[model samples]
Target: GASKLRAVLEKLKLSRDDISTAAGMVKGVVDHLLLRLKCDSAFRGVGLLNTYEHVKISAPNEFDVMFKLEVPRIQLEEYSNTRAYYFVKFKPKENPLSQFLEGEILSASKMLSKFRKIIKEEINDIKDTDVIMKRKRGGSPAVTLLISEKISVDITLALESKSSWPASTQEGLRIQNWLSAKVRKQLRLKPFYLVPKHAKFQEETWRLSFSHIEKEILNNHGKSKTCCENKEEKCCRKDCLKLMKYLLEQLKERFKDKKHLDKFSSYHVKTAFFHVCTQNPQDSQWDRKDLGLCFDNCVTYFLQCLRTEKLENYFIPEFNLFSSNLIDKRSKEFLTKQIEYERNNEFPVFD
Candidate 1:
């Protein structure tokens, strides 16, 4: 029996035989507390509770403990009053996910910051400055090509880990949170506002969202004709390899652009995300940008490229790390630890 149970039993002056009954009753209380916590999206991480943290508390005189994970209400009010209203009114309000950031920052002005201003001004500068705009919004052009001495474009790319599922050592769930956070931060670019098509692609296409895939897998997908393990080449065999290769190649084409070989050459990789994939034993196939690096090392090396670009141009890239969007404390904490592990186990930097 737990020490707390013994203490509580002594305090209540309960008979020795009643101790077992009291212990079960006390357990019920803890279970109720845990269920309450799990139901709340904020404390959703507790659902993935480690055994060490799991407990059954007992106390005399009907003891009660309130779990407080306050998200300072004052900060929320200030943000809603100033910055959030402005942001919601002007930039694309349809974006449900981008607006999620409105929760973390207390003041909207601080949250919106210079990024919005810089992008807005940059677009204005390009609009009347004799540049050909590709996309349009609110009867105005979005991204305009400079109508000047045509020079080659030096492209810089960046990837950031998004959602931080605060709880759970389970690799897949934790990384899923981190990747989600990075994606959210990236979408806030003024470019996304102008380039509505890109915004849609970023959310629906670019995200390697496992949840959708998991659902497909769970719904008796194995019985489908498309099930690969049933084929001549099993899921672990050649068909799977062929599919993997195609996916990798598709990503490569996006970054390296194989068909443009005659006109353009491979540019130095700016950055790419490589959060710990807890599903498999780390299946990394960044062959196009193959620096032969491991997971977290790849992220770090890419971060360096991102930093260099910022230094040269004196502007932050649309996507980068520490650009917080993840708010769940449990998910956030889990990601922090995973990143620590990745950095600690530094492998090759790329590929």
Candidate 2:
């Protein structure tokens, strides 16, 4: 029965104590980094996004901390039609970050390289900790710190923009029905961040990151304010996401030979989950008692996205996350087949 599904989700949830400990340790490391890094005085840590969202599945070993570099009165140039990537420019004024700028475009790679070096140097001075800078992975913007064998933190550098949301996002974030227009307006007023990450072409582009908004939406994800305030009002939206993430992780592990599966990440699942939430924008639709049905709906939506090879970024609708440039056609077909098998067989990999 659905009890089995609930049991699986329960195990997937991270304990509060574990989360606190991990968050504290990561915060300590970030605090240390802030004190020693002198190049950018505006650099500030914005806390861990994944942990704050409560969507972190399995162990509390991994973390993502966004370090905001204040760039006031800056300009943004669209990198492509996707509108997910941008080239941040300064308004013809000398600033602390001017040294990292190449012509008019701010070089994300150069800035990120400097940040990574400082982190490496500062990490050596942190006593009573086994924190070591992990070797850089291609196309990843994070300066990863391997705290322990089990614990790792991804320190990403983001340019904080106080400007309004871009036009590309005009069609996205269809949460008006779910969270109301006022809530959406309030969230849009908050600053959006651009990280130093590149796509296939390897150009100097910064990827738009709405991690804060995503966290806020996930935390307050309900048609009513008290949708999950009490046991009786609890909704299964987060539980469904956790189960979906867990299922993907399990499938990826079981089919290690299928390297294409690596193309799929938790963000894809989260994006699909958000879309599904928008489609079924009602408290009763996600009642905790019907978690099994909610999770099935989430999985079905994801499978449909995979089959269609089109999962748009929730905030920037123009960006196709499953684009051929990112995931090969064969890879998509392969993952679709594997996931279909898992879904049809009640997900034996989950067991």
Candidate 3:
């Protein structure tokens, strides 16, 4: 290892000439030099368009093994053919080594619940919107759920995307109970916290939210609508259009304040919109503005009045930079004293 490190330094062959021209050499490479090479770089005029498979196939396996032994090697991420990757090639010889696992077809909400744990483990703190942003940036939304606003525990929907998910009217109660278990496990909260009768968690402000596609809603026949008359209607865009109105009706009837948060820009259905809008960007049939209008009409009015503030405040937190910024009724008094000292004396003021 010591010899290897020494060899690397020797290979560079640093000189007074290199030091004198280092800045100009750096600028020359940065501006106009298109083909740059690392001392260890593999692909260049000599090795361009090469791959392990290509190397193997272009020669007999025996010669390939000999050539590989003679050349220094490294594994790299990039496949530079500039193509859409739809399939993979694997050694059939290794097929016996793979295995399978089975479980419930995880719903969207359950996936978020799982991901929330993963993210918290890897990162000290990751906000929910960062998760949502990653999802929006062409990432998969593997599972869906109706979560509590707190993300504490409440993880089922009587009206899941599946019409057959709930077998009876009692399914609603079961939904509540399933959520209670997840909440208890994830947040370590007591049993009665999510129970409607024991008080609180069923309120509008505490409810987790989602966005559904108009076509999916129409096709699925509105899972949350329990009444027979609503089912007879087949969940049209017209009926879904009134979702905001219905929510407003619920909030007015309940919360005493007419305001509820708007979550229009963050709708997940924008994933579908991308495919639809970009279908024929250069053609007469492809007007992004009209597609936007279609979305505005179909996104449902229930989203129109939603306040971005609630989701923003819940996820992208703002706190005093000097301190943890976690002051609340639950916060200990003297922990914030350090930041309080900075504000109390304005000695560095430039005003």
Candidate 4:
């Protein structure tokens, strides 16, 4: 069973050439945008936040690149009951992003629009490349760029906040026992990001993003320092996540007609993976030889979250990824059935 799981993971893994080609295309686009949009050096591509983190499953066709606009002395106010969204308020002092401010609040919509327009204009100028800006999806903050019909890059604009994390995240990141409190403190010191994203309401709102920290955690995801570094000390934690992510992706593709399954995303898989990691913190528990068992444990945990309809955000505990507003009862029940079928039948979709 473990060997079967390993074989599936090997098939799902992206090749080095594929990664570099897509990454190069992304770099070219970002560099072109940087050259064309030279204003206060406020806007700059930080790095590839998604596939670059090595958590991506299957193809390297999609990328999430984070571009941050310098917003010094930014203040965050919770937008609604959902602690995920926030209203970014800047200091009285003017900056490059000040033009996007409505009253004191920095309008996420305004900044995103300007960012999108600039990207559109620059994309048109490039001659050889086949890059084109995708039509804006409703309620999505990303300025998507489709490259050569294969790779799609979601460019998200974010405000870098160097202050302490919001109170909402105080109860989350339960990694003290897993990654250690000292590591947690060091991670908290790193700045958190607020992307231009809103909930049900049309009001301008910023969604808290911890992709940076998440990448860090996943890279060093072991109780011991050399858990995956040494040959004899290798763990299957990442393998389990990759398998879970692949399972969700395949399930979504298979049940494309079932729109409700759309609510289940790769982020949910990652969030659940983190929760599972904390639950089974010891490296020995995720021994590479126990790949099938670790993956089964992950599936069981996710199934339970689905059954309960309460998969809380790993950072902001108040926000539920499986909230009824986003996922309906019928959808949940259908997905639960499909997952159970896959679990019982050796996940034929994995082929």
TM-score of each model, in listed order: 0.18, 0.91, 0.17, 0.93
Candidate 2 at residue 264, lDDT?
83
lDDT of 2 by residue, 1-351 (tens): 468777776665535334456666777887788777744443443333334533345545777676766678878888766578788877745577766888889887777777777788889988868897877785354687888566687777777778888888888888999899999889889888888777555788888888777668877999999989998889999888878888877777777785868788888988999999999999999998898788888988998898888999998887899887888888888878888887777777777
lDDT of 3 by residue, 1-351 (tens): 223322322433332124333233322322221132211122121111112111111111111100010111111111122111111112213221022101211122332333334333322232322211122211122112111121111112111121111111112211122223343233222111000010112211111112122223233222234322443332223222222123222222333342221211113223222222223222223222243233333322212212111111211112111122222322222212322332244211101
Candidate 4's residue-wise lDDT over 261-335, tens digit each?
Answer: 877788999999999999999999999888888899999999898899999899988888887897887888888
Pairs that collide in candidate 4 are: none
Best by TM-score: 4
Check candidate 2 and list the clashing pairs: none
Error of 3 at 74 (Å): 46
For candidate 3, the lDDT comes to: 0.22
Consecutive 10-residue window with the lowest summed lDDT within model 1:
48-57
Against the true structure, candidate 1 reaches a TM-score of 0.18
Cα-based RMSD of candidate 2 = 2.5
After superposition, the stretches of candidate 3 with alpha carbons farther than 4 Å from their true spots are: 1-116, 123-217, 220-351
**Candidate order, lDDT descending:** 4, 2, 1, 3
